[PDB]
């Protein structure tokens, strides 16, 4: 027990295999009298744009509506040659994000194409 809730960032220092259980905690907190209030309107708008860019990508990749989604894109090894027994158990998400930061755009490009192929194939089947 231990009343484990952890909190908004929660166990940011925990490993990935422990940390990816609080994904919803963070998601629920991302949206949260005269003049010069434009500073806050600017802040509100930018928060909205950040939210939408993330949601659009989940949409494009076919992972919309999920906190965790499997894809059919292979891990190409050069991105990280660590074992899953090392990645999920002895690393935090922050360490991981740094570990593979240089491949962010590679993975994202591959994800977009995979989804493009999947939708194309579904239409061919529905047209059958």
């Amino acid at each position: 027990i231990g009343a484990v809730f952890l909190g908004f960032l929660g166990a940011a220092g925990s490993t990935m295999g422990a940390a990816s259980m609080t994904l919803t905690v963070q998601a629920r907190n991302l949206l949260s009298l005269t003049v010069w209030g434009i500073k806050q309107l600017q802040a509100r708008v930018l928060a909205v744009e950040r939210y939408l860019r993330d949601q659009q990508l989940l949409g494009i990749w076919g992972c919309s509506g999920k906190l965790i989604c499997c894809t059919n894109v292979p891990w190409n090894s050069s991105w990280s040659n660590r074992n899953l027994s090392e990645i999920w158990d002895n690393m935090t998400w922050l360490q991981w994000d740094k570990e593979i930061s240089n491949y962010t755009q590679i993975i994202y490009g591959l994800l977009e194409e995979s989804q493009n192929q999947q939708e194309k194939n579904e239409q061919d089947l529905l047209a059958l």
């Binding site: 940011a12 994904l23 949260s32 010069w36 802040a43 906190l67 990645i87 935090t92």
Partner: protein, 430 residues
């Protein structure tokens, strides 16, 4: 094996705009965002992070907002540029010199009428032109002078800063943190503690105290071009006064346009001054030395000398109390050599009414007279010191940017951008 995750607990350092918040007229009506009556503080288990108080954008924002608010507060107020005339001037009424008794021909509600008016002035705001003698207000050759509205208070009511959605603030719990580098124990908050937007020069008059030991922080120490900020682990009691029962009168200078003038003084004319507990002060300097020696040598002699020359804002200790601006001679506080192996100090203070509040050119504020007698009580929580730069290390008090009075509270906080989207390999495939 790619799996995409959203709600990932990661962040990047980022510069964003924080907003103010307030717990239930300057500052006082700045309701900002109402604060949380019982704010949550989340300890981050296993998490460390690096901080740098000398590069903290939060300090820059306090400067940006504090300065802006004071300028905004004068927007609707009566201008005193109509007073930029020659004054005839003499002494007041005293035996045996700070005050002056000056008179001039002022406008009235009608453009066709003039009136003879007079008021008391402080020497520091008046300059002789005819090198009775003829004088002008000292700032009328270069700047606009605006009267602060008499109904508006500038009391430094504490306000909180809070991150916007998508951002959070990391806070140090490290009692020994020296302002930079890894901070082994942190937590996350949405809002900082309330901080009083106090302005001062040589002494830090109302901040937080160090938890255990006097903390000495500097961007460098070795580099003598940098300031040293000293945070006491106990307050020093200081009592300041402007021991003159003054009166005020309003003058109608135009249509709804009023000027507030010093009337006369009831009773004796006495110098403004501050009383610092002597015993406490000596003890705090000794504590400061014990800690300063960590950077200079265990048996290195440390000397406290007075300030260097320049404007009162850098040679004296200044503050706003009761609406008056005090310039105290702190040399009485720094007269000691510390060599390895009840009473009070009275500091005279000068009084000014035309203030270049942010040390800018062209925007002068006039502090309307305050009636009655002023008494100020504060907790000195720290000092701004510089190295006077081989067996003796001499320090002097001095002024600095207003930013240095804020980083003194902000060193424990950092703001980061939350970045919830990311990927990792797993054993699953669609």
């Amino acid at each position: 094996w790619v799996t995409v995750y959203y709600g990932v607990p990661v962040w990047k350092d980022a510069e964003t705009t924080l907003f103010c918040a307030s717990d239930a007229n300057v500052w006082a009506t700045h309701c900002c965002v109402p604060t949380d009556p019982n704010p949550q503080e989340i300890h981050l288990e296993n998490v460390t992070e690096e901080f740098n108080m000398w590069k903290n954008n939060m300090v820059e924002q306090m400067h940006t907002d504090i300065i802006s608010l004071w300028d905004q507060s004068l927007k609707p107020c009566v201008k005193l540029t109509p007073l930029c005339v020659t004054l005839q001037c003499t002494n007041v009424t005293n035996n045996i010199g700070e005050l002056k008794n000056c008179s001039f021909n002022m406008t009235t509600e009608l453009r066709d009428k003039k009136q003879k008016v007079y008021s008391l002035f402080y020497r520091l705001d008046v300059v002789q032109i005819n090198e009775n003698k003829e004088y002008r207000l000292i700032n009328c050759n270069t700047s606009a002078i605006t009267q602060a509205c008499p109904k508006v208070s500038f009391e430094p009511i504490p306000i909180h800063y809070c991150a916007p959605a998508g951002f959070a603030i990391l806070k140090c719990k490290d009692k020994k943190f020296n302002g930079t580098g890894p901070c082994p124990s942190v937590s996350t908050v949405q809002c900082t503690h309330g901080i009083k937007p106090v302005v001062s020069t040589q002494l830090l008059l109302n901040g937080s105290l160090a938890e255990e030991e006097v903390m000495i922080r500097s961007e460098n120490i070795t580099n003598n071009a940098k300031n040293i900020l000293v945070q006491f682990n106990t307050p020093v009691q200081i009592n300041c006064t402007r021991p003159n029962n003054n009166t005020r009168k309003s003058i109608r200078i135009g249509p709804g346009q009023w000027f507030y003038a010093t009337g006369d003084i009831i009773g004796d004319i006495r110098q403004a001054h501050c009383n610092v507990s002597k015993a406490t002060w000596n003890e705090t300097l000794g504590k400061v030395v014990k800690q300063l020696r960590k950077h200079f040598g265990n048996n290195t002699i440390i000397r406290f000398a007075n300030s260097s020359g320049g404007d009162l804002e850098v040679t004296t200790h200044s503050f706003n109390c009761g609406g008056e601006f005090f310039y105290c001679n702190t040399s009485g506080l720094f007269n000691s050599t510390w060599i390895s192996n009840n009473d009070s100090i009275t500091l005279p203070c000068r009084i000014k009414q035309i203030i270049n509040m942010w040390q800018r050119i062209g925007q002068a504020m006039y502090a309307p007279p305050i009636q009655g007698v002023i008494r100020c009580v504060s907790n000195i929580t720290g000092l701004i010191l510089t190295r006077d730069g081989s067996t003796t290390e001499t320090f002097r008090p001095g002024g600095g940017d207003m930013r240095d009075n804020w980083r003194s509270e902000l060193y424990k906080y950092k703001v980061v951008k939350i970045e919830p989207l990311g990927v990792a390999p797993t054993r699953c495939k669609r």
